[model samples]
Target: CPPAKVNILAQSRPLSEWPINLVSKGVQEYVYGLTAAEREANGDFGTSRKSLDRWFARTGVPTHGYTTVQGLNLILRHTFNRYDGVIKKVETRNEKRRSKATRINVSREADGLPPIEAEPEETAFGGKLKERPGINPSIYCYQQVSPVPYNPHPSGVGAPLPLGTPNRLSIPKGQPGYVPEWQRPIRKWYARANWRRKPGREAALKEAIPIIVTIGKDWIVMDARGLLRAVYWRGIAKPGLSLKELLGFFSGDPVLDPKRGIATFTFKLG
Candidate 1:
């Protein structure tokens, strides 16, 4: 949630703390006023070099040295981009809310009552918004001077590992070295020869492999070609688990055959 009154000066510090000291006090005042005005009209604004320079020029401010622009830009970024500043305030609020809920749950537990679940908050756009995922929510909301660039590398090969790999060696509840059905690793089998996917076989595999394996369990076996595709489809179908967990879902020990150059994945149903 945004603040009731957004003051750049209040949110940020004076120019003294800045690395470069060449910027005049007049420029600092002008920049603050500009940011305050822009933020008032639209909650967020861009901080591009050209845009900042243009703003400075339009206001008849001297853009003599690079230090002035750099220093002012640093101030702007600090107010907007600093983790403890405006960007993290939203997360800080979220953390407080979660802690409060946890305290309530602890009391409820002591009273022998079921724990209360934190429901998703309603967004201004009429949709439910959950706590921000692994990625920063600000990336989606605030426009940057230099926007996040798209990955030039292709997707399939560099898919992240599943969530379970880190603690795979550790045993779950019950017997020693016993892994729960949900925690069982999913493997990818690569064959040296061309493995043609017959419609009949595909149907059989699909039928035999349960879509919703268990209450909180889902696994799949695919070849090298279908690795990325399988991840994409399963991610959409199963909203319960995260993309990181899904990556771990497909991360199993690779079996390589030196003689035939065949990589086989074995699934023991028993």
Candidate 2:
């Protein structure tokens, strides 16, 4: 069952701690704010309730994980883009329509209990309302950043090895404990002529082969995920940026701010 209430944003908690009630509430608001055509696009009001029922049925089960994550993403995304562009039109259209129903459920009920407390009173509306920013614009990256060795699984960070298992880390031909700049980029088995020579060699060369490298003499094995997702600090910290200079926004760094609240960050550079 969904909790009686939940926070709209929860940053530092585990997946188990993500708000279930908040997501369903957002879906309710979104659907209520949609026109008949828009609701039909989302499978009309009936099928939407059915689909959500199935999702909530699996509520505390592992089967719920994927959809739950997706719902969380949707809630955040919708909040950030609230009533902007086409969505504002949908909300306006729905406001003038009469599709609300009685006995609508907003929270989970026990097996023999009523699904809702009572029907809600309808309200009048206009399109000039303002809202709080869904996320703050200053809570972006982690502080005290450093390159940690890549661990494919979160628990593999410092597990004991029984020997012979390749750690997948290596130093380049010249550097004592690091690789050259060109070699820092990941290469593939196809880059080697004898790619088919050995199974072990193929696996080792294919992916996740992090090479040690120095960033101003601070040795770090830049993890593959980090290399793919993180940007160079120097390249983006320059002065003067136009709208074209922007690429994307950032959000969610619990360690940098209130872990228990709805605050996030955003910045971009070209």
Candidate 3:
């Protein structure tokens, strides 16, 4: 539930020569997403023109009343620094949590707990966070509450990461193969026969723990590359087999339930 280590660097430039229209359009896009009601619900501190002028002047913009584009660069740089600080803090925390979790697992294994052979850890992309051997947590994709596109250059692009991409997926629906191993279908089942009852339903749902499985060293996931995986997983069967039945589908023993004969694995997509 926490963060990464990204660097937030900004450069000082003139507002007159700056990409004024682009910056304004980018900011407007954000405001357009929020409605009057949404703003009221969240509470808003109205931003004033004078305040903008003051901030701009402080940053190096020469205009006092701020009708021109002269002093906006300094203000933009300052804003960048503030946001960057927030991002860096979040990432540092994520790194610490990962490191701590790894340490706990190693200590547990040495004391004879279920041996957890952790996956290779990737150090976050920024800061003093360490990426030494035997450290870091086993995690999949990092999440974002409100993920704007990653911008390698804040001041150099038309739009950071566009809302949509022109990227194409080559695999046809009919010919794609099934996933004989990981990323299979899963279903939510009642733990007891009377799961319709309040307590039964709650208890049963609680037992449905989200499990993460890795195919060890052979499994290396990359963005866009794994998009077709689940498509094929479902294609494992036009309609697939239950989790229990698929358990022994491969000779390999399942780490979660090594032996089983009555489980279903359905999936939900976003």
Candidate 4:
């Protein structure tokens, strides 16, 4: 249950411009699916806002408070660094600072969460800042108890990596060793058993291990992109998975039994 290389980076402050209104926009959308639209449209002119209100009215979802203004990045990293950066194991304790601040501060060489892996840069929009590798976060691990989205701009924009994109990777073809061989026996088996919606097609994932990942202090992710991904992932997986759950899913090779077809499982990160 320990990370391959635990290294955590912790910090505090206004991580993002996670304004209450904007965050609530998402909250309302979640609860009152079409409530915002219905309310804004007064029945005939259904729009995103109106839809939010209508959904809320029918669902009776209550208003949630955005006590702090941090984005998911902050929410995630803070949790990782706070929990994994310190002592080698999870410990319940009292602390007002970061989650289990006591552990993070006490253990200097303890198990640490790898600093947020920094992705390489890209020139997508003619030198526009771009995350090198992307990721898929468990929506459930998504939370508001921690430090990121740091230095959010007044425009709700900030420096952050794009979430939900696969940690970009590459593999050689026509071989069966380190690099995933293409159309080879090794590739065939790897392709088989991979999770997919189609019954008989090769799964979409090429390489599970990340060839390259990034983590820079100032390499803040953008809010719009994060929100976009949250919305997109929700649409795709239907929120059947949370950020933490997905991360755990890839924590290691699954431990299972041939007899019962069930066993303890874990994913490993290289």
Best lDDT goes to which candidate?
1
> Would you estimate the TM-scores of all the predictions?
0.24, 0.22, 0.20, 0.16
Tell me how far the alpha carbon of residue 90 in candidate 1 is from the true structure, in angstroms, after superposition: 7.0
Q: Count of backbone clashes for each model?
A: 2, 0, 8, 56
**TM-score winner between candidates 2 and 4:** 2
Model 2 lowest lDDT segment of ten: 1-10
Score candidate 4 by lDDT.
Answer: 0.29
Q: What TM-score number comes out for model 2?
A: 0.22
Clash-forming residue pairs, model 2:
none
Over 143-232, each residue of candidate 4 has an lDDT whose tens digit, in order, gives 332113333222221322223333223434433333334533412334444535685761223312111111222222222222223334
Ranking by lDDT: 1, 2, 3, 4
Top candidate (TM-score): 1
**Candidate 2 per-residue C-alpha lDDT over 1-270 given as tens digits, one digit per residue, 9 for 90 to 100:** 111111222123422223333333434354345443443454222224445455445332122232433334444344324434344555555553423322133224334555544444333233322332233222212222222333451211233211222322474455333445666673332344644588688343233323222222122232222222232332542323211221222221111222443222233222
Off by over 4 Å in 3: 1-70, 115-270
- For model 1, give the 10-residue run with minimal summed lDDT: 2-11
lDDT of 3: 0.30
